Design a protein around this ligand. Structure first.
Ligand code: GNP
Ligand code: MG
Length: 178
């Protein structure tokens, strides 16, 4: 089987760890871990080809800025995440994550991922965002950002409902196979 390394990055609490676990274990996590720490290699088939996907979780907090580059060597595809309930995490795509990622992984394909799609129409989410004069990220905002950073594609998903999750990792696999 083809062996590809995947690294997921994005702001603290935007759903990275839950996405890896929903995809690799088909279950939304109960217990809390900052990063998936036990082995995390998932299988996927794309156009007849069997692909082995090593999932490298990272921490989004600035506390971990010193150590996160230790995960970047030999990366084949990057999942760059924001949360649809957080326009701030989108604005950190060009201001924080693309600079860091493209510095250590200069030509590694990027899939831009908007997590927590199930909160786009969530009442508490919109009330929280409205009090800051904000609304959830619209799909055209994610597309525009993806074009702007040169991502191979833009995908939306919800780890909670699993909607879009498999597609995210299929798209990432296609990018890495290039
Ligand atoms: N509604 C909703 N909540 C989600 C979804 N994915 C994750 N969450 C929730 O969002 C919170 C953060 O998720 P988590 O995966 O820990 O985020 P992270 O990006 O890995 N955080 P960190 O960088 O600190 O490790 C948790 O409370 C989790 O249950 C989703 O698709 N929908
Ligand atoms: Mg995490």
């Amino acid at each position: 089987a083809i062996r590809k390394k995947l690294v997921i990055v994005g702001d603290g609490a935007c759903g990275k760890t839950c996405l890896l676990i929903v995809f690799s274990k088909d279950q939304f996590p109960e217990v809390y871990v900052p990063t998936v720490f036990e082995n995390c290699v998932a299988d996927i088939e794309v156009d007849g080809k069997q692909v082995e996907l090593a999932l490298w979780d990272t921490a989004g907090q600035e506390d971990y800025d010193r150590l996160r580059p230790l995960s970047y060597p030999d990366t084949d595809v990057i999942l760059m995440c924001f949360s649809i309930d957080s326009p701030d995490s989108l604005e950190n795509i060009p201001e924080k994550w693309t600079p860091e990622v493209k510095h250590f992984c200069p030509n590694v394909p990027i899939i831009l991922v908007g997590n927590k799609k199930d909160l786009r129409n969530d009442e508490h989410t919109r009330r929280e965002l409205a009090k800051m004069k904000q609304e959830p990220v619209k799909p055209e905002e994610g597309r525009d950002m993806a074009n702007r950073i040169g991502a191979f594609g833009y995908m939306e998903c919800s780890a909670k409902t699993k909607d879009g999750v498999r597609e995210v990792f299929e798209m990432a696999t296609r990018a890495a196979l290039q």
